[PDB]
């Protein structure tokens, strides 16, 4: 149909795993992580993960909310904006066996090139500047309220804002099935 009308925006450190930001980007796995643009190349480290503490991990309820999302493509879209490395990202995604195919990532830039997930005001603004967004439900979850409320100032300067549901919890009190019947009772279409 080429038309998008319900986005998810979703943080990823802190909101999707269990531990903020801050102490998991310098952290040696997700160094490591960085630069492995494959799965073969990720997957090596998936022993490290599993015995990692279990903060780091991408939460037993995200996991769940990532995959009934999914099942509602393409009439809900799920974009993950983040200051981290796309490869730490999909590693993880891929540890836990989440198919992330039309999951859309703005992440950090490689070296000195500033990627998309750095600005998350910006990243927000130009994902729903693309042609084919059109006005609709807004999920937006970040576990950290400045970041969160840039989220949501891209929606508002867009015009975009008029149904939003924004949640900031701390890392692990992510209320998401909750928010799961959010999107079904603001997406009519989705209920199918
Ligand atoms: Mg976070």
Redesign the pocket.
């Known amino acids: 149909e080429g038309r998008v009308k319900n986005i998810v925006y979703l943080?990823?450190?802190?909101?999707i795993t269990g531990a903020?930001?801050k102490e998991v980007i310098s952290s040696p796995l997700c160094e490591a992580l960085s630069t492995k643009a494959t799965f073969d190349e990720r997957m090596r480290y998936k022993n490290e993960y599993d015995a990692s503490d279990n903060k780091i991990k991408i939460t037993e309820n995200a996991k769940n909310f990532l995959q009934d999302v999914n099942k509602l493509h393409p009439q809900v879209k799920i974009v993950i904006i983040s200051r981290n490395h796309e490869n730490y990202i999909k590693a993880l995604l891929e540890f836990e066996n989440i198919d992330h195919r039309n999951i859309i990532i703005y992440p950090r830039g490689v070296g000195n090139t500033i990627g998309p997930g750095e600005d998350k005001y910006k990243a927000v603004v130009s994902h729903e500047e693309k042609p084919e967004c059109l006005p609709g439900f807004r999920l937006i979850c970040?576990?950290?309220e400045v970041?969160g409320e840039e989220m949501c100032n891209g929606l508002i300067h867009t015009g975009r804002s008029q149904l939003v549901k924004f949640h900031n919890e701390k890392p692990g009190q992510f209320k998401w099935g909750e928010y799961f019947k959010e999107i079904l009772t603001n997406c009519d279409i989705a209920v199918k």
Not at 11 to 15: L, P, R, V
Request: no cysteine; hydrophobic share 10%; charged share 55%.
């Open positions: 943080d990823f450190d802190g909101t903020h930001g970040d576990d950290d970041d």
